[PDB]
Design a protein around this ligand. Structure first.
Ligand SMILES: [Ca+2]
Lengths: 59, 235
């Protein structure tokens, strides 16, 4: 159920039959293959930093 | 923002500033290409307003700025129902021309009523803006941000003689020194949920700034999410 750790759903969790769980994401994202995490379905999904800030890393 | 730090370019790409009778008088957040959500007390019926997205340093040119005109202003229908209370301190601004989304111009995510409230209950969010960095002090040139913990309602209630309704919430530190302030209104109170930021509040009001025993008061977005989605629908 969604009781613990949001039912492992990265974003939204809704309780289904037999204590099962149905995850979902917000506009601009898509429920991955594992029905758990959320992935960018557009060039600039809401709420995410894409500038990476500064300039000094492996990338 | 009092006692905060400079944001880095692009750290809060949904943040915008509002210019008008006064330059940089309030902040706001990008809902989508055509709409900005802000505080109603920032936009009195009448006066012309301009929005600048991709803004970082108010006195410089970063070549990431996008200026737009406001053609329609929609303050919550219940704002100012009761005189001088700031209940329902939220408004929506429609842009004349859509913004071009990019790394410096990105919408803030808005969950539903249930989840916005859950995200708020995590108890820690960020507030940002170009407001005063000192009570009755100078405004900031570089966007400021500050992390603020949620405050229990009973403590909130006892910190002021003024009324705190269920459309508001408190955030700040018991020791003071850190708080949002004048000029920060309309800016967002956001909660980071595993890398994805959600709009959990709107900077609204307070008694002075950063004073021990006082907290920042924020408009509780969970109560207004349906209203926001309904009015900002893209066609
Ligand atoms: Ca600038």
């Amino acid at each position: 159920t969604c009781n613990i750790k949001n039912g492992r759903c990265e974003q939204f969790c809704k309780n289904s039959a037999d204590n099962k769980v149905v995850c979902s994401c917000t506009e601009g994202y898509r429920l991955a293959e594992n029905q758990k995490s959320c992935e960018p379905a557009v060039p600039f999904p809401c709420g995410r930093v894409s500038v990476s800030q500064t300039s000094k890393l492996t990338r | 923002v009092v006692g905060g730090e400079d944001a880095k370019p692009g750290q809060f790409p949904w943040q915008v500033v509002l210019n008008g009778k006064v330059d940089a008088f309030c902040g706001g957040s990008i809902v989508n290409e055509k709409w900005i959500v802000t505080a109603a007390h920032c936009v009195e019926t009448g006066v012309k307003i301009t929005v600048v997205a991709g803004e970082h340093n108010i006195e410089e040119t970063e070549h990431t700025e996008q200026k737009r005109n406001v053609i329609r202003i929609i303050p919550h229908h219940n704002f100012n129902a009761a005189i001088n209370t700031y209940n329902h301190d939220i408004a929506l601004l429609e842009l004349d021309e859509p913004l071009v989304l990019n790394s410096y111009v990105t919408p803030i995510c808005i969950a539903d009523k249930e989840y916005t409230n859950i995200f708020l209950k995590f108890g820690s969010g960020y507030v940002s803006g170009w407001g005063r960095v000192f009570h009755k002090g100078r405004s900031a040139l570089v966007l400021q941000y500050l992390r603020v913990p949620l405050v229990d309602r009973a403590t909130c209630l006892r910190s002021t003689k003024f009324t705190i309704t269920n459309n508001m919430f408190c955030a700040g530190f018991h020791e003071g020194g850190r708080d949002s302030c004048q000029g920060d209104s309309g800016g967002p109170h956001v909660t980071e949920v595993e890398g994805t930021s959600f709009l959990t509040g709107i900077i609204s009001w307070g008694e002075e700034c950063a004073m021990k025993g006082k907290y920042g008061i924020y408009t509780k977005v969970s109560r207004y999410v349906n209203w926001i989605k309904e009015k900002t629908k893209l066609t």
